[PDB]
Amino acid sequence: STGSATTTPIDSLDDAYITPVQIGTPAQTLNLDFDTGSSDLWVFSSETTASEVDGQTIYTPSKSTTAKLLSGATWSISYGDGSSSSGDVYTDTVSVGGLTVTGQAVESAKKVSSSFTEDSTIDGLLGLAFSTLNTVSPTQQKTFFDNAKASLDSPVFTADLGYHAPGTYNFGFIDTTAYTGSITYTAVSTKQGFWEWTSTGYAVGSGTFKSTSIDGIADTGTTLLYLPATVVSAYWAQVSGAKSSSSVGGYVFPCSATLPSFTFGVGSARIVIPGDYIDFGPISTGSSSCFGGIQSSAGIGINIFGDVALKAAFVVFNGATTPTLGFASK
Numbered sequence: 001s002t003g004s005a006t007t008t009p010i011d012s013l014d015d016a017y018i019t020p021v022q023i024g025t026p027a028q029t030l031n032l033d034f035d036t037g038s039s040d041l042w043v044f045s046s047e048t049t050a051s052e053v054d055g056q057t058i059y060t061p062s063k064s065t066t067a068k069l070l071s072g073a074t075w076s077i078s079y080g081d082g083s084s085s086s087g088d089v090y091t092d093t094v095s096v097g098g099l100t101v102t103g104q105a106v107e108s109a110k111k112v113s114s115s116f117t118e119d120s121t122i123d124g125l126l127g128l129a130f131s132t133l134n135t136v137s138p139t140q141q142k143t144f145f146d147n148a149k150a151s152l153d154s155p156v157f158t159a160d161l162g163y164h165a166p167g168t169y170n171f172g173f174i175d176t177t178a179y180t181g182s183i184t185y186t187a188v189s190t191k192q193g194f195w196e197w198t199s200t201g202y203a204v205g206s207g208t209f210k211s212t213s214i215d216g217i218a219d220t221g222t223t224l225l226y227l228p229a230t231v232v233s234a235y236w237a238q239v240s241g242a243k244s245s246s247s248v249g250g251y252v253f254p255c256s257a258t259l260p261s262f263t264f265g266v267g268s269a270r271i272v273i274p275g276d277y278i279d280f281g282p283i284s285t286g287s288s289s290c291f292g293g294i295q296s297s298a299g300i301g302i303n304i305f306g307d308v309a310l311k312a313a314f315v316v317f318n319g320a321t322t323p324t325l326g327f328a329s330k
Contacts, residue, residue: 001099001100001148001151001152001153001172002098002099002152002153002170002171002172002173003095003096003097003098003099003148003170003171004067004097004098004168004169004170004171005019005020005096005097005168005169005171006020006097006166006168006238007019007161007162007166007167007168007169008018008032008166009162009164009165009166010119010121010122011121012164012281013280013281013325014161014162014164014223014307014311015161015162015223016033016122016221016223016307017033017034017121017220017307018031018032018033018121018122018123018168019031019032019033019034019096019097019126019169020032021094021095021096021126022066022093022094022095023043023059023068023092023093023094023106024059024061024063024065024066024092024093025064025066025092025093026063026167027095028057028059028060028063028064029057029274030043030044030057030058030059030124031057031121031123031181031316032122032123032124032125032126033121033122033124033126033221034125034126034128034159034169034220034221034258035125035126035127035128035129035219035220035221036074036127036128036129036159036194036195036217036218036219036220036221036317037080037127037194037217037221037304038077038079038125038127038129038133038221038222039128039129039130039131039132039133039134039135039143039193039220040075040077040107040125040127040133040135040136041094041104041105041106041107041124041125041126041127041129041143041144042077042087042106042107042109042124042125043058043106043107043109043123043124044056044057044058044059044060044076044109044110044112044123044124045058045059045060045061045087045108045109046058046059046060046061046062046108046118047087047108047109047175047253048087048108048110048112049095049109049110049111049112050108052098052111052112052116052117052166053116053117054117054120055116055120055121056058056120056122056123057124058123059106059108059123059124061090061106061108062067064092064114066092066093066102066276067090067091067092067106068090068091068092069089069090070089070090070091070105070136070139070141072138073088073089073105073137073138073139074086074087074088074089074136074137075087075088075089075107075135075136075137075307076135076223077135080300080304081115081219082113082115083112083113083114083116084112085109085111085112085113085116086109086111087107087109087110088107088108088110088137089105089106089107089108089113089268090105090106090108090320091103091104091105091106092104092106094106094144095193096126096144096169096171097169097170097171099148099152099171100128101146101147101148101171103148105134105141105142107136107141109124111169111303125221126144127143127144128143128144128145128157128220129143129193129194129195130143130146130190130193130194131143131146132190132193133193134160141267145157145171145317145319146319148171148172148241149176149319151172152171152172152173152176153172153173154172154173155172155173155318155319155320156171156173156174156316156317156318156319156320157169157170157171157172157317157319158170158174158175158178158314158315158316158317159220159310159314159315159317160175160178160179160222160314160315161307161310161311161328162311163274163276163277163311163312167311168201174316178314178330179307179313179314179328179329179330180328180329180330181329182269182328183314183316183326183327183328184266184267184268184314184326184327184328185267185316185318185321185324185325185326186198186267186324186325186326186327187324188289188318188323188324188325190323192217192302193291194217194218194219194302195217195218195219195317195323195325196215196216196217196219197215197216197325198213198214198215198216198264198301199213199214199215199216199264199265199266199305200212200213200214200227200265200267200268201213201214201264201265202231202262202263202264203262203263203270203291204234204235204238204260204261204262204263205260205261205262205275205278206260207238209263209265209270210234211265214227214228214264214303215302216230216297216302216305217302217303217304217305218265218305218310218315218317219229219304219305219306219310220305220306220307220310222304222306222307223280223293223306223307223308224255224280224293224294224295224304224306224307224308225262225273225278225293225294225295225302225304225305225306225308225309226295226296226297226302226303226304226306227294227295227296227297227303228296228297228298228303229296229297229298232251232294232295232296233314235252235260235262235294236251236292236294238260239253239254239256239257239260240254240255240257241257242254242277242292244296245289248283248291250270250291250292250295251291251292251294251295251296252283252289252290252291252292253289253290254288254289254290254291255281255282255287255288255289255290255294256288257325259275259276259277259278259279260275261273261274261275262275262278262294264305264309266327269327271309271312271313271327271329272329273308273309273312274312275325277293277308277311278292278293278294278308279293280292280293293308295309312329312330313327313328313329313330314327314328314329314330316328316330
């Protein structure tokens, strides 16, 4: 089998991407944030505290003839941005772009933190990291990809995120029309549960490529590119007036600037992020200070190849017995 679904930016900045997902019988369609940095499929629901729902579409398990309470199971998750959610668990039929999994754990939120409530466009998350990170207790549950894998034509999914435009998540096949050149594959460590890999270096604008190993995670659920402070300083030093602002929480730059590109290495191959992809707009409405799309990872504990990086590439998440990642230009 295969599946293919369009993913759409939630706003004019590409702060996140939503993909429609069918849950239950009859189908209830929710727009989920596909997150290769986490491993829970959780949704706003008829069980979510009413004051914490503000415009989201909810899953109502009592209206699904295929929903079954997973007795005794609870979940609770906290994300790198400080947000969180928790609740109980159902199993139900879940379909993405024509690919159907029966018995998928659908984690129903009883509580969500303010940032989720405040984002009316995201009805939940669909985790695509390794199932060892799944938070369901006392019986850990598998991701949608893990459950689908054996049925897929090939044990892979691909992320083709758009810049200020829709893109595609494919399951079970590699669309050879969706990228240019060849796909360069690179090793993955699953030891932390992430799609963790090592970039071979970077360049700023037309500058020379610096060969240096940068371990990080391919994370569709993170907006920006988080890299070591040395790399990030080298980038922003090429932008007149750019500075790190403790009050804003990262590098800002004059909105009048033209940003240089940023290149990252995948083996001997190179992925170029155009400068425009690094502009996240005014820090507050009407400000002439703009927020940068490349930020330091120094306070995180891990480097994160988020959407800013991934949207410059066609990315293969290869879930073969030894997983690997593939990157192609497009």
